[PDB]
Amino acid sequence: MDIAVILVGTTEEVAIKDVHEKDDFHHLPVTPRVELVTMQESDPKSIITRICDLMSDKKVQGVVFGDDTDQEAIAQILDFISVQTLTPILGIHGGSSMIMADKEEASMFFQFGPSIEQQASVMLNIMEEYDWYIFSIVTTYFPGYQDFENKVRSTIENSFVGWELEEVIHLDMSLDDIDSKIQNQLKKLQSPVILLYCTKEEATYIFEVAHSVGLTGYGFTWIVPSLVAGDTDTVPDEFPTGLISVSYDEWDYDLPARVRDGIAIITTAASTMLSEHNSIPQSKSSCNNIQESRVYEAHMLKRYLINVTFEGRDLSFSEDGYQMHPKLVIILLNQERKWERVGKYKDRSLKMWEHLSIVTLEEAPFVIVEDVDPLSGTCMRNTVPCRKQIIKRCCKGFCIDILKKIAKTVKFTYDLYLVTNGKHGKKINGVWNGMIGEVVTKRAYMAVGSLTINEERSEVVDFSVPFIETGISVMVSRQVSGLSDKKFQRPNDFSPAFRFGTVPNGSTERNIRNNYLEMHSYMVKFNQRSVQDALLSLKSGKLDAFIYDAAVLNYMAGRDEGCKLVTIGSGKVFATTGYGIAIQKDSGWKRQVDLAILQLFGDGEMEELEALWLTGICHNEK
Amino acid sequence: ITGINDPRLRNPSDKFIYATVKQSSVDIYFRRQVELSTMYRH
């Protein structure tokens, strides 16, 4: 085959272009014959002249163009040339890579570029990656609008997720403003994530206006399609920093590597067309005379030629003549004037590269560990992540929601994990255990859960006010009216052996041991592994009464596979207490928390949350 | 089953099944609606 490639500017003859192709794909039955010419300077008259002149010396069946230039027009000129020669031309860099008008169907042209819909898609993927759900679009009358809106409308609409489009703004750069009408619109929008679409210069004006409006400042973020960043060589600092935009790469594929890809595409296309018809692609190149006969056959090649692959990598083009999911790099404006790569994206898929840690434990009311959907890979809905050293577990429930609301009101951020050692806080011999340890070790600032309150822990750590009425209580099948009757005090007084037990290492058990020794020493035999298992001892028989926290026992009273279980008396509990929350000591956010708590009931949210999480179906009947 | 909102539904059980057809419009009610979105999975 006969092929030609050209490089413009850089002021250089460079070895690397041979190095580029490094006699690449020599293996292919058909060999490329290459003639290289470079031009220090380009002109539509110069560029037009040189390639045809080269047609006269080389009679090449394909051309690759490359430039140092920022110039938009060159690509389009080359499209015209494709129309003229009916000889394929493509380009690996610069202006030829820069986007152009929709290509004539008859014409054969390729660019290392993309489109508008694809870019919008990448913007959406980027937003999805950072999970920025809520966004607005500021656009201008510049071409592609409301097709941008349309593409977004489909892309945003199809997905199940409830992301929000806040505003779409269309402002004409023409009829330039004394009114600062752009300021007047732009100032209005409250959204955190902004997609902008316009000419580069217009972007300058819109950004000056945004800087006046205050839209550029922290927490709001801007995202841009390819056009505004352009070359990226020159960046008026009128653009805000942290500006996020998409662009073509230039490192993942050296100028020589890209040329090698182009040569490979031309010769691969030649090879596929050969394999199909066993026919030489070579054709008379001369523009001046009429197009050579049998050039019309080349048409079929293009239809066939659209997807070309080398190195197990797709150069596959699209109907516009841009490569399919061309190396498309996610780029950001690094501090100062730097443009630094962040993510890479290709084809369908994209890949991009006051603390107060809280510890909890899994219980019944307001506290449930669930295993997240593996396909999803991350937690869903109300579930908030919690880690357990032994793996990510997903915690959700009443307490989780309360924590979320308190945090929302006081406006701070937090890390949540699960306790390993000793569950609920326990004093054994000299030393404490459980979440309280991590509160003491300062491995947890505040501990949240079904944790009960007692004098010792209030002594060591400040506690939040009780949100719920709870305490020690009994759960039994259908006994103690006095409930202090001492029938509990001694089993032995009653000739048949009686039975009652509770979970060990509990505030209940410690309290019991403190006040009533005999009960503890007797009940150690009736102690049970877990609340589900304690329930197993009650439910299947072999145990008469069960004793546990009143909130849990009441919720379990309400929730049972059959209404076989009920509370004791009115469920009016001795040791009247409520669930608190740990803090370190006298120094803490402290009171600020407390206020938040009573705002929660203050708006009546707790009743709703009670109906949803705490309310059981049972005990309606009685 | 006391109501459309049945505590028995609200108190689901592996032991007590409640059955439907996937892709039945009811399923669309379950997926589209956020308020009961938790209840859909059971």
Resolution of the PDB structure in angstroms: 9.2
Q: Are strands A566-567 and A472-476 parallel, antiparallel or unpaired?
A: antiparallel
Q: Are strands A89-91 and A109-111 parallel, antiparallel or unpaired?
A: parallel
Dmax (CA) of chain B: 27
Is A222 in contact with A240 (CB distance < 8 Å)? yes
Q: Which residues contact A217 (CB under 8 A, 6 or more apart)?
A: none
H-assigned helices in A414-515 = 435-440, 455-460, 507-515
| Residue type at A262 in one-letter notation | G
C-beta neighbour count of A545 within 10 angstroms: 19
Element (H, E) at A257: helix A255-277
Name the residue facing B15 among A561, A615, A620 (closest C-beta).
Answer: A561
Is A469 in contact with A610 (CB distance < 8 Å)? no
Using alpha carbons, list the distances in angstroms from residue A194 to A132, A186, A310, B23.
10, 11, 38, 37
**Closest listed residue to residue A7, CA positions, set A113, A108, A110, A92:** A92
Beta strand spans in A212-348 (E): 221-224, 244-247, 309-310, 313-314, 328-333, 339-346
CB-count exposure of residue A75 (10 Å: 0-12, 13-18, 19+): buried
CA atoms within 13 A on the CB side of A565: 28
CB-count exposure of residue A304 (10 Å: 0-12, 13-18, 19+): middle
A436: left (phi over 0), alpha (psi -120 to 50) or beta: alpha
Element (H, E) at A538: helix A531-539
**From the DSSP assignment, how many helices (H) and strands (E) are in chain B?**
3, 0
CB-count exposure of residue A318 (10 Å: 0-12, 13-18, 19+): middle
Is A50 in contact with A17 (CB distance < 8 Å)? no
DSSP per-residue string spanning A123-173: HHHHHHHTT--EEEEEEESSTTTTTHHHHHHHHHHHSSS--EEEEEEEE-S
Distance (Å, rounded) from C-alpha A451 to C-alpha A27? 73
Long-range contacts of A37-43 (CB under 8 A, 24+ apart): A37/A4, A37/A6, A38/A6, A38/A7, A38/A8, A38/A12, A38/A13, A39/A6, A39/A8, A40/A8, A40/A9, A40/A11, A41/A8, A41/A9, A42/A8, A42/A9, A42/A67, A42/A69, A42/A71, A42/A74
Indicate the DSSP class of residue A571: -
CA atoms within 13 A on the CB side of A70: 9
Element (H, E) at A386: strand A384-387
C-beta neighbour count of A589 within 10 angstroms: 16
Distance (Å, rounded) from C-alpha A139 to C-alpha A133? 19
* 3-state class (DSSP) for residue A516: coil
C-beta neighbour count of B30 within 10 angstroms: 17
Is A288 in contact with A44 (CB distance < 8 Å)? no
Using alpha carbons, list the distances in angstroms from residue A557 to A528, A531, A568.
19, 13, 10
Is A280 in contact with A29 (CB distance < 8 Å)? no
A144: left (phi over 0), alpha (psi -120 to 50) or beta: left
A143: left (phi over 0), alpha (psi -120 to 50) or beta: beta
Give me A171's structure tokens: 């402002």
> φ and ψ at A517, to 5 degrees?
-75, -55
**Closest listed residue to residue A350, CA positions, set A114, A133, A137, A124:** A124
* 3-state class (DSSP) for residue A245: strand
Whether A381 has its CB under 8 Å from any CB of chain B: the answer is yes
- How far is C-alpha A522 from the geometric centre of its chain's CA atoms? 55
Whether B8 has its CB under 8 Å from any CB of chain A: the answer is yes
Give me A314's structure tokens: 């797709």
Name the residue facing B8 among A162, A381, A617 (closest C-beta).
Answer: A617
- How far is C-alpha A452 from the geometric centre of its chain's CA atoms? 38
CA atoms within 13 A on the CB side of A327: 18
- How far is C-alpha A506 from the geometric centre of its chain's CA atoms? 41
Whether B10 has its CB under 8 Å from any CB of chain A: the answer is yes
CA atoms within 13 A on the CB side of A422: 17
HEC string of A53-66 equals: HHHHHHCCCEEEEE
Whether A561 has its CB under 8 Å from any CB of chain B: the answer is yes
Is A200 in contact with A233 (CB distance < 8 Å)? no
Whether A598 has its CB under 8 Å from any CB of chain B: the answer is no
HEC string of A466-494 equals: CCCCECEEEEECCCCCCCCCCCCCCCCCC
* Cα torsion A528, A534, A540, A543: sign: positive
Q: Which residues contact A106 (CB under 8 A, 6 or more apart)?
A: A83, A86, A299
Q: Which residue of A has its CA nearest to B31?
A: A160
C-beta neighbour count of A111 within 10 angstroms: 27
Question: Helices A298-305 and A255-277 meet at what angle, rounded to 10?
Answer: 120
Distance (Å, rounded) from C-alpha A459 to C-alpha A561? 41
Whether A617 has its CB under 8 Å from any CB of chain B: the answer is yes
Q: Which residue of A has its CA nearest to B3?
A: A617
Whether B17 has its CB under 8 Å from any CB of chain A: the answer is no
Indicate the DSSP class of residue A296: G
Distance (Å, rounded) from C-alpha A481 to C-alpha A147? 76
Is A136 in contact with A165 (CB distance < 8 Å)? yes
Q: Do B34 and A162 touch (CB under 8 A)?
A: yes
C-beta neighbour count of A606 within 10 angstroms: 19
Indicate the DSSP class of residue A526: G
Distance (Å, rounded) from C-alpha A510 to C-alpha A56? 100
CB pairs under 8 A between A and B: 20
- Tell me the residue length of chain A: 622
Q: Which residue of A has its CA nearest to B39?
A: A612
Distance of residue A376 Cα from the nearest chain B Cα, in angstroms: 15
In B, which residues are within 8 Å of A616 by CB distance? 7, 11
Name the residue facing B10 among A162, A561, A617 (closest C-beta).
Answer: A617
* Cα torsion A586, A591, A592, A598: sign: positive
Give me A110's structure tokens: 């390729």
Angle formed at CA A141 by CA A139 and CA A142, multiple of 5 degrees: 90
Distance (Å, rounded) from C-alpha A47 to C-alpha B30? 64
C-beta neighbour count of B10 within 10 angstroms: 18
> φ and ψ at A279, to 5 degrees?
-120, 135
